[PDB]
């Protein structure tokens, strides 16, 4: 409900989607 | 000093939102971005339900709500990491937001006036340039299987 909570959750989901789509060479 | 460049970066991103989100022409011709826009349009089709669910219980049809989505883009790199997938996710999300505002001109125009700058900062201009910028992203989008 907090703006900070809203922003944190959306950002986390966006980063997770990005990370799943990413086709950069992964770390060892 | 990339001062001559920042206006053009924000404009290129706005043209992605115009092209992919609103299916409308942009102000200048960006040939390198043609395959990038096609790729984004494909992500939007194949992952529509995912993005619409991100905003399911978010009251974003307001200037404060649009702002919060821009702040959300900035926080994607909160963990200190950036990568091409996240960059594309940011650009796809901005395009979806424009699309969803397409019947609300004042809010649509607000989103096109602020989200490009948020996305520019969220991607990271130094990070992006060090990787060839739009030429790098065009190569990623053309050389690699989804």
Author numbering:
A (entry chain B): 80 to 107
B (entry chain A): 1 to 146
Sentences from the paper on this structure:
Kaposi sarcoma herpes virus (KSHV), a member of the gammaherpesvirinae, has been shown to encode for KsBcl-2, a potent inhibitor of Bcl-2 mediated apoptosis. KsBcl-2 acts by directly engaging host pro-apoptotic Bcl-2 proteins including Bak, Bax and Bok, the BH3-only proteins; Bim, Bid, Bik, Hrk, Noxa and Puma. We also show KsBcl-2 adopts a globular conserved monomeric Bcl-2-fold structure similar to other characterized herpes virus encoded Bcl-2 homologs and binds BH3 motif peptides using the canonical Bcl-2 ligand binding groove. KsBcl-2 lacks any significant shared sequence identity with mammalian Bcl-2 proteins though it does contain a recognizable “NWGR” sequence motif in the BH1 region, which is crucial for pro-survival function of majority of Bcl-2 family proteins.
The KsBcl-2:Bid complex was refined to 1.41 Å, whereas the KsBcl-2:Puma complex was refined to 2.11 Å. Clear and continuous electron density was observed for KsBcl-2 residues 1–146 and Bid residues 79–104 in the KsBcl-2: Bid BH3 complex, as well as KsBcl-2 residues 1–146 and Puma residues 130–155 in the KsBcl-2: Puma BH3 complex. The crystal structure of a KsBcl-2: Bid BH3 complex revealed that as previously seen for the related BHRF-1 and cellular Mcl-1, KsBcl-2 adopts a typical Bcl-2 fold with globular monomeric topology with eight alpha-helices and alpha-helices 2–5 form the canonical hydrophobic ligand binding groove. Binding of Bid BH3 peptide to KsBcl-2 occurs via the canonical ligand binding groove that is formed by helices α2–α5. The four canonical BH3 motif defining residues from Bid, I89, L93 and V96 and M100, are bound in four hydrophobic pockets of the ligand binding groove. A fifth hydrophobic pocket in KsBcl-2 is occupied by Bid I85. The hallmark ionic interaction between pro-survival Bcl-2 proteins and pro-apoptotic BH3 motif ligands between a conserved arginine (R86KsBcl-2) in the BH1 motif and aspartate (D98BID) of the Bid BH3-motif is also present. This interaction is supplemented by multiple hydrogen bonding interactions between Q82BID and Q68KsBcl-2, I86BID and S72KsBcl-2, D98BID and N83KsBcl-2, D101BID and G85KsBcl-2, R102BID and Y140KsBcl-2 as well as between R102BID and T146KsBcl-2. A comparison of overall fold of the KsBcl-2: Bid BH3 complex reveals that it is very similar to that observed in other Bcl-2: BH3 complexes. For the KsBcl-2:Bid complex this additional hydrophobic pocket is utilized by N-terminal residue I85BID and in KsBcl-2:Puma complex this additional hydrophobic pocket is utilized by W133PUMA.
